[PDB]
Structure formats: C-alpha cells, structure tokens
C-alpha cells in the first residue's frame, strides 16, 4: 500500500495467520479491499445470504455509508461476484 501518509513514523504490531494461508489468499484479499475502499458503486451477485453479509461488513458501521450498494440474489450459484466501479 502506497500513500502520502508515508512520510509518518509508526510502530505497529500484527497478529498474523498461518503464513501458508497468507501466501494462498493475500493477493485476492488485497483486491477486495482495494476495490471496496476506493469504489463508489459496488454490486454483489450471489446467494441472498452471503451478499447481505458482505454488504454489511463492507459498510463498516457507516464508514462507507457513501458507497452505493446493489444486491442481486441468486440461487444456483456458489460464491459471490463483486463488481466495483469508480469515476471522477
């Protein structure tokens, strides 16, 4: 991650998962966060349950109450598809 707050000193501790899990999923975790952090429209397509859970985690107790979420319940579909878009 690369910000104009990287002039700033820090001292941070992190409780890590199993590094094998990090290796396995870090690239995809970064996408997800990168895409919801910056996006203005998120669309979630998947099981009616799973997409409601993600919409709520993503909304962060209203730290992202400015994102426009659009849910599309499905049935015969395993997984959740996110579509993020941004614009100036």
């Amino acid at each position: 991650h690369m910000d104009k707050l990287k002039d700033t000193p820090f001292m941070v501790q992190v409780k890590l998962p199993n590094y094998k899990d990090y290796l396995l999923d870090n690239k995809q975790v970064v996408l997800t966060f990168k895409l919801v952090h910056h996006s203005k429209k998120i669309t979630l397509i998947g099981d009616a349950n799973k997409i409601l859970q993600y919409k709520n985690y993503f909304q962060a107790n209203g730290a992202r109450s400015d994102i426009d979420f659009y849910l599309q319940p499905t049935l015969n579909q395993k997984g959740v598809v996110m579509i993020a878009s941004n614009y100036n």
Binding site: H1, P9, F10, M11, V12, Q13, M82, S85, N86
Partner: protein, 161 residues
C-alpha cells in the same frame, strides 16, 4: 469493546509537528479512517475503473483481511521488522516480508515455539548517522515498554528482550 489503553495512538516523537502512530496492541482496524489513509493508495482514488471479481469465502475473508492489509502497508515501509513465533512461521514470514519490504529493513527473528500464530512488529523511524538510527530505535522500544505497555500485557513480550 477495545480497552482504552489498547486503542492505537499518535504521540509527538520530537519537536516536529509529525507525530508517530503507535499500534502496539494490533487494534488499528484497516477500514478505520480515523488515523488517516494508511491503507489504500491515492493511485486509484479518482481513477475511473470497472472491475469484476470472485469474493473469497466470507468467514475466511473476515479473519484475514486486517492482518493481510495492515502487514502489506506497514511491512512495505518499515526499517525494522521483528517476527516472533515458531521457527516454521518466522521463516515463512521472513521470506514473505523480505520480498515485500521496499526500505531494506533489518530483520530480527525471535523464536517462541509456544506461539500458535506468528507476530510481526513493524518500526519506521522519522526522516555516524548510523548511530542516530540506533538511538532512535532504542527510544521507540522504550516508549512502548515504559509508557504504552502494561507490565503483564503479553502482546508486548517481543518488545522487551
């Protein structure tokens, strides 16, 4: 929910206006904008984009989002990285973080075979000059032990050899 001394805190490390972030207890949430835009770049902030992806399984994602995002931001820029835990784990993360780090950090591996998960400690210092560097590092580790850490807080054990 989070005890007040465990909340992440800024602290004036000098007569500079630039304060330093102390998250000794791993409680800075990544989605939290309070302390500034540490995580997430501005190379996407207003770029027009449209992307489609398969989300990780939700429970799995929840339990690794904060460590993975925080590690990636902090560990990229640190000058000292300590990895504490089993031999199998500190080794695994030394290779992960040597790769990630863009500021030639020094690595210290502290072996603790009772720790079921490893623990990384990320220090970045402001701005013969090698002697200054060492003294700065000693003052941050003192400010964390004396000021921030409670005597029996166990997260703090890799800060106090």
């Amino acid at each position: 929910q989070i005890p007040d001394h465990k909340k992440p805190q800024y602290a004036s490390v000098d007569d500079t206006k630039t304060q330093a972030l102390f998250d000794i207890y791993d409680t800075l949430n990544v989605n939290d904008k309070s302390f500034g835009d540490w995580f997430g770049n501005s190379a996407l902030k207003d770029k027009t984009y449209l992307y489609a992806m398969d989300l990780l399984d939700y429970n799995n994602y929840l339990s690794i989002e904060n460590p993975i995002i925080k590690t990636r931001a902090m560990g990229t820029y640190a000058d000292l990285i300590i990895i504490t835990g089993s031999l199998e784990q500190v080794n695994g993360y030394y290779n992960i973080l040597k790769a990630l780090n863009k500021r030639n950090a020094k690595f210290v591996l502290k072996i603790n075979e009772n720790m079921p998960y490893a623990q990384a400690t990320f220090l970045r210092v402001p701005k013969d000059e090698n002697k200054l560097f060492e003294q700065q590092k000693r003052a941050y580790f003192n400010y964390a032990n004396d000021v921030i850490c409670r005597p029996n807080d166990e997260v703090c054990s890799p800060l106090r050899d």
